């Protein structure tokens, strides 16, 4: 599962990535996720 879909976008808890053109790297936010963040 070190894979997405290349150029769209996921949620990881609270944060927004976007999966690289590798589809092996995203950039995410780096917001702290507490409880009922998500």
């Known amino acids: ?6 150029g ?3 949620r990881n808890r609270c944060n927004t990535c ?3 053109s590798n589809g092996r790297s995203a950039s995410c936010t780096l917001m ?3 409880p009922g963040s998500y």
Not at 1 to 6: A, I
């Open 1 to 6: 599962g070190s894979s997405c879909t290349p």
């Open 8 to 10: 769209a976008t996921f």
């Open 18 to 20: 976007r999966c690289g």
């Open 32 to 34: 702290a996720c507490p």
